[PDB]
Every structure is written in C-alpha cells, then in structure tokens.
C-alpha cells in the first residue's frame, strides 16, 4: 500500500484546478477594438470611401 501514501490528487487534477480557464491574451483587446473602430472610421470620418454623411444628411444641390 505504498500508493496510499502518495498524494491522491493527481497531476492532472492539479493541472486542471490551477490552469482552469484559458487566459485572455492582451492583443485580443487590440485586434477586436481595432476591427470595430475600423467600422467607426468607415462610417463617420469624412475621408472614408463609405461615409454615412450623404446617407444621413443628404446634400443640397
């Protein structure tokens, strides 16, 4: 019964109770907010190719 003096918590259980969640990378915030502020740039700049300012306040020719 040598096995009953070893720690009963396996190395698997340590590795799954210590690294429980896959941690958030810091570049995920950058790439997500950049891919959404590209849409903020596209709609709302006055130099984008697809501005909303002519679909919203049309013109007066």
């Amino acid at each position: 019964d040598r096995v009953l003096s070893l720690p009963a918590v396996s190395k698997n259980q340590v590795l799954e109770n210590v690294f429980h969640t896959a941690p958030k990378a810091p570049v995920e915030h950058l790439e997500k907010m950049v891919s959404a502020n590209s849409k903020v740039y596209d709609a709302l700049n006055l130099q984008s190719k697809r501005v909303l300012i002519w679909q919203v306040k049309p013109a007066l020719f």
């Binding site: 909303l52 002519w54 679909q55 919203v56 306040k57 049309p58 013109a59 007066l60 020719f61």
Partner: protein
C-alpha cells in the same frame, strides 16, 4: 418663392456680424459700394438698386440629393443619433 420679390438695397445689411468675413457697403443715392473680404481674398464689385431686383428672377430651387429618399435619410439619421 413668389414670382415677384420686393427686397434688396433698402434696409439691407450694412455690416457683417461675424469675425470671419468683413462686409461694408456705401449705400449711395442710386447704387452701393460693396467691398467684401473673407480671409485671403478681396472682392469689390458694384451693384445698383435694380441689380438686386433682377437677382430673384430665376429661382435657385434647391433640392436634397439623397441616397434613397429624404424620408429614409431622416429615419436613418434618427437611427444614427
């Protein structure tokens, strides 16, 4: 607008109200000495009292150039706001 307008060089603006563009006129007995400047440019032309009455002869008649409609752009503008 109507086909006949009765405005011009009688109780006209004799001065500008901003700081961005300078207007001064000399309303004489017949004509006006209008000289204007807006930043880097100068403009000094001569208008008569009957020169502004000819101005409303053909109307400008502005109109919205919309992507779909003026109605649709107003609803889209409210959705954007």
């Amino acid at each position: 607008l109507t086909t006949f307008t009765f405005s011009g060089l009688q109780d006209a603006p004799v001065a500008a109200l901003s700081g961005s563009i300078k207007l001064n006129v000399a309303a004489k007995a017949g004509k006006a000495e209008v000289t204007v400047a807006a930043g880097a440019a100068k403009a000094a032309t001569q208008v008569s009292a009957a020169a502004l009455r000819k101005l409303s002869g053909s109307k400008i008649s502005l109109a919205e150039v919309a992507r779909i409609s003026v109605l649709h752009s107003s609803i889209q503008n409210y959705l954007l706001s």
